């Protein structure tokens, strides 16, 4: 595993992401739900604290929530159960 460092939309590499879940569809739904969670954490920050938490990893200067979710995925910071 000696790939050159990725950049932009391909960070983290999807092949290392796929080892965490079964298929890429599971990755899609994983990251979508987690990014939604992060988004409404950002929305529900002004009022009282509720059950939502995150982002567990430190985001960038300005970073889209989905990128944060996928980076959290790659850092082994979540777990799940399918249907």
């Amino acid at each position: 595993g000696g790939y050159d460092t990725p950049l932009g939309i391909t960070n983290p590499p999807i092949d290392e992401l796929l080892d965490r879940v079964s298929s890429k569809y599971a990755l899609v739904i994983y990251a979508a739900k987690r990014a939604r969670q992060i988004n409404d954490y950002y929305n529900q920050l002004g009022e009282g604290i509720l059950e939502y938490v995150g982002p567990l990893v430190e985001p960038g200067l300005q970073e889209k929530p989905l990128s944060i979710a996928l980076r959290e995925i790659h850092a082994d910071l979540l777990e799940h159960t399918e249907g």
Binding site: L56, L77, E79
Partner: peptide, 7 residues
């Protein structure tokens, strides 16, 4: 659980 405790 580990990172929820970390937070």
């Amino acid at each position: 659980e580990e990172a929820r405790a970390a937070a």
